[PDB]
Amino acid sequence: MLEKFCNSTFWNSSFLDSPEADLPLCFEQTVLVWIPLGYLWLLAPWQLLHVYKSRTKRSSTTKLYLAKQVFVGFLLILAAIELALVLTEDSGQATVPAVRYTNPSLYLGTWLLVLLIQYSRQWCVQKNSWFLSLFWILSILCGTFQFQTLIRTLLQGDNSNLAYSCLFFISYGFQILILIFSAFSENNESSNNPSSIASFLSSITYSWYDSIILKGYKRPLTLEDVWEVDEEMKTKTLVSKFETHMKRELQKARRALQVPKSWLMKALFKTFYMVLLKSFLLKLVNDIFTFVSPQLLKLLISFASDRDTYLWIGYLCAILLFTAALIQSFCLQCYFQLCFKLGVKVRTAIMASVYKKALTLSNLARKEYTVGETVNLMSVDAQKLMDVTNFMHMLWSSVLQIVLSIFFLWRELGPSVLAGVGVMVLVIPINAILSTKSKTIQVKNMKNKDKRLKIMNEILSGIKILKYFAWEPSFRDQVQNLRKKELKNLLAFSQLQCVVIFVFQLTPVLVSVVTFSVYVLVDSNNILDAQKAFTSITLFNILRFPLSMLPMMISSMLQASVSTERLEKYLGGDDLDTSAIRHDCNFDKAMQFSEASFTWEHDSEATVRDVNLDIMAGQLVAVIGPVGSGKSSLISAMLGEMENVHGHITIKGTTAYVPQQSWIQNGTIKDNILFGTEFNEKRYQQVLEACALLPDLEMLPGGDLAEIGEKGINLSGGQKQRISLARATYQNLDIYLLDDPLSAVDAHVGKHIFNKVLGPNGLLKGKTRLLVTHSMHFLPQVDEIVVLGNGTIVEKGSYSALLAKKGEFADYGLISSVEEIPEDAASITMRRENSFRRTLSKFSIYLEYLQAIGLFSIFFIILAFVMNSVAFIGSNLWLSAWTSDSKIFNSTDYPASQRDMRVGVYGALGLAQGIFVFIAHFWSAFGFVHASNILHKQLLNNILRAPMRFFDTTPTGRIVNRFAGDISTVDDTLPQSLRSWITCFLGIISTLVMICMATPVFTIIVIPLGIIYVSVQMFYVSTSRQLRRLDSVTRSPIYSHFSETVSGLPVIRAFEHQQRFLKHNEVRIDTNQKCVFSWITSNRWLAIRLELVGNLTVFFSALMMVIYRDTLSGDTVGFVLSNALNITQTLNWLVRMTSEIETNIVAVERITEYTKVENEAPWVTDKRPPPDWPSKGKIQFNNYQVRYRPELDLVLRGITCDIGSMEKIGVVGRTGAGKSSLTNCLFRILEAAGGQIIIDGVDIASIGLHDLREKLTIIPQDPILFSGSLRMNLDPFNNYSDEEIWKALELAHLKSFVASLQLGLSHEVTEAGGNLSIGQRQLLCLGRALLRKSKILVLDEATAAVDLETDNLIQTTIQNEFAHCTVITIAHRLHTIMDSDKVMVLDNGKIIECGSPEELLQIPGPFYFMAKEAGI
């Protein structure tokens, strides 16, 4: 072809048929040099015009840019020298070939272009791009052959082309060096985030993320240490981009109504097709290159089989086994980030779009959804869309992989392959049947789980009563009975989990048995050979994942079809209509009702009926009417929240509104006051003083910076009403709407605010005030009063105008998709579903967990697992010996006995691998369940044994969250992950042993490949663990914020703060985006580094086979290379589990922390008091001291007192009375410091608590009841009969009530006695004390909050029934101790006066001075 061009042959096939095979010189110097040259001139204008599109300010000329510019200048010099050398030299006898000087011409031309673009790249933000990085990469691979050809030719002594050779070597060396400089990013401070400044070789490698990994590992990582997301990923841009497509296409869907449906998906696709297209043209590259590894394996096996194949075939088939894997590696991760980033980019387009719809949504469309049913609309109902939008491509890519794998397998084995794929297909119904069976059992368990929470909250909140009455053994067995019923069901779930795992784990070795046995037995001449044997095993490790993860792509995709419907309904709702209410400035006065009629819903009566009313913009106006008759709707009428049927409302200026129920945000109390406007010291002091928040402010700890809201300190209705009024006043608006501002405030307090805030001289003189109330306290000062009747006004006038005329009417994080780890993609999906059900409602730690597991059972389980690896090793090794039969035994000469022997042994080895892996998982379930039985029991014992001091310090909510919100982790997620870790760490070890037994020298290479693997795992775990908790801590505020704005939405529209609240969500969502995307790259940084090690393991193994080809048999390379191709996927899988195990193991450590809590004195000691010990009340003090905390101070200073039988002891005090301390004193609740108290000749310290505690009675101030029933509440052990219980109820006068109940004692008591009134609950505690019938009664303010009639009843019952028992009474008021035989006075831990109240009153004493003559 190029005879007139090259003067030599273009291509001779004989050149490649020799051991010293070299490409023809003409072919390399022309064809392979145009591919890089043609790559530029074809695409050079495009990358030039696109650069010209973004004309920005050029950065300073960096040193690196100059170096990569002068060096290319040398290439211009070298190319020019070569052209001049060829032409200026005198040789005309032989005409120069065209190739000799034409090639410099393009090199002269192309380097001129490179000089131009490299300078023009400065204007762009990214100093390097795929246009130059690929060209340098492509000009080295194509130019390598010339470098090899010239070097080999020069080594032969032919120096005819020495001048060209030396110039080419320098040109080749500089191109390699230029590539090095092209991988370095020139810092120009365009943005703090390096993603937009990273060079191309640093953006398909993620070396720009190295800074965080290095920074995170050293010191703890914090929010400000993570760079903000790219400008495109910003939530402000995404909402606007999604808004245009949503609004234009929703109207199209509205036209089809002549409720819109099937409209959300058609909008999302039209908005992100530019990202979808880039993930489709690039996914095919991964699928095409994933079948190269098996196809290249056949070539390498054939090379080892024959001793005639040339050496260069092997090396070229080993380099290609690394290049075709690097391209697959870099492209696959460049797709994972290009598609997971779409998941984050689609949730933001919905999470930040529901909020904007929430403000504008009509309440009529909000009536159906509750508060909880709206908060979950994006925490679960929109997070369902991530997983669907995370990896859609398996809807088409999985179909492609199974269809292509079948074709390749059918091309190598024959029709018998259909039987093999049939077995894997038949697994899918087994998986589906087991999955839907496990879900039924799991969800049926959630009802028993939540019941334990209800009791668990119940026990801790009220442990004081539990310690007093010593009832905790009864509840301990009550919870254990519930837990035992729980654990019996849990074990069945674990059994169903050791089968799905066993079926899925065994399916790659069962298909091999079926496929090979049928192939060899169907026909005699079908001999098995290593070329067609191991090319099938490695294909079964490729087809397995698409055909096992496909069924979840049907359930999950269908699971979004219902989740989309809820999102479809909400976004499609009709927004509120503001045509009824007008805002204008031309209007003179403030208010105007033009025959307005209003109704709550369309199918309802009009609450407002045809009223004309006008108000001047200068006075206070109040509205008075009967409660529940067209009154509460009036305030909402001038707000846009209320529906209109016929009317015309106009309002001038801003409006301020105060609701009946108070909506309060979380944060400091200052934010709820200023409302995010400003902070004026003079104004702030005015509203705070006028609104009288000072009597509260000194009471909340932290002063004005207290944590208000559910997060911190809750407030009563009265304080909440004041805050809402204070917020409105500070805003300083025009019109104020008051809706019962003084409904729940104190009467005297209500006097204070009315006069000075909104009265004759209040700060609101210049602002109109509309007020509604039913209390007749203050309406003499109101400028104008309007009386409503039948929903309309009846009389208008002031108090003296017309009213005086008559006056008669007045988890799962770090795994974005199951695609990243297809080794076990099933257990991942169940883990997310466990989390979704939830949201709808160092080495010493491992040993501690393993000690909970039967340690004897551990050594057998690990023995079964390691024996499984041996069987796997034996099976593959035996298969290698089987394929050796083809060489020795000719076709049609294969003995039938030998054929039957081969399959028979392989069948048994398919069973030794089967019967052992099942006996390990099956025994894993019986062990992991037993751990939960022991671990939970330890917590329920020590915690119930914990001192009252322990509960006082730590919050109650902390313990509960660690009782079942943490136990769920140790027995749903931890057991399944651990059994899925050792089953893969034994895959890496098994694979490495396989290679080491073929080429022993390879084990040296393991050490560099072990240090790298450990270092990468160590770095990633030390960082991604921090990045996991840092996401959860910042994800919760988004959902928490939405609950506070959907509930307080009517207030928001009153102040027109919609725009401010939207911006609050933009920053709040963005802070989550900068964290979710922050580990996605951190997850990709694992894959590239580890697949680089996985590729190096395979590449360095193929060289060992190639080099040691004289001794290695052809079939031996099969089981060494077929099982090594799976090391790439297993290697990154192993590290991910180690991250999740190391994160979920903190749950066990937290449990152990409370299990080690210091424990009180033994319940039962060697001394048991006789029944006559509580027979008489002999209480004596011996200078006893008490201490709340062993380090603060001494509460008691050695009180000494003698108490005889029938001594009505009255103990009183003002400050530090120790009345609480005395209750903890007599019952051994606290520790004994310097004294002791002797009872009936026996010291309390000697007696065991449980025997001691039961023998006295106590009535707590707070009557907390129990949720079981009344029968168990009165008596947990229930040793008493029904007649005694009925008599006790009669004694407490509950007989008439309980007998009138539904079933009496069998009545279902709700939480905290929610079905019983406060006065009712205060009578149960008397019955509880009545049942004891013991001589000692300790009282502690049981009548501080009871009515007088019941108060007289309560003491009389104590006076009458316990007239035969010693009673010690504690009362804050001295009006209940005149009936006391002995009255005790003490202050700050020291007794003041001793004596009866009769003699105490005669002598003027300190208690007489402060309580009798001054307190009376």
Residue numbers in the entry: 1 to 258, 305 to 856, 884 to 914, 963 to 1537
What does the paper say about this structure?
Bilirubin is conjugated in hepatocytes and excreted to bile duct via the ATP-binding cassette transporter ABCC2, dysfunction of which would lead to Dubin-Johnson syndrome. ABCC2 is a 180 kDa full transporter of 1545 residues that structurally consists of two half modules, which are predicted to be the transmembrane domain (TMD) and a cytoplasmic nucleotide-binding domain (NBD), respectively. Notably, ABCC2 also has an extra N-terminal TMD0, which exists mainly in ABCC family and was suggested to participate in the subcellular localization. Here we determine the structures of ABCC2 in the apo, substrate-bound and ATP/ADP-bound forms using the cryo-electron microscopy, exhibiting a full transporter with a regulatory (R) domain inserted between the two half modules.
The apo-form structure of ABCC2 shows an inward-facing (IF) conformation. In the translocation cavity, we found an extra density that could be fitted by the N- and M-segment of the R domain, in which only the side chains of the M-segment can be well fitted due to a relatively higher local resolution. The M-segment is folded into a short helix and a loop, occupying the translocation cavity, whereas the densities of the C-segment are untraceable in the map. The M-segment of the R domain is fixed in translocation cavity via abundant hydrogen bonds and salt bridges with the residues from TMD1 and TMD2. Specifically, Glu892 from the loop of the M-segment forms a hydrogen bond with Tyr381 from TMD1. In addition, Glu893 forms a hydrogen bond with Asn1204 and two salt bridges with Arg1205 and Arg1257 of TMD2, respectively. Arg904 from the helix forms a salt bridge with Glu1261 of TMD2. To investigate the function of the M-segment that binds to the translocation cavity, we generated the variants E892Q and E893Q for ATPases activity assays. Interestingly, both variants displayed a significant increase of ATPase activity compared to the wild type. We further performed the transport activity assays using radioisotope-labeled substrate E217βG and found that E892Q and E893Q also exhibited a significant increase of transport activity. Thus, these results indicated that the R domain binding to the translocation cavity functions as an auto-inhibitor of ABCC2.
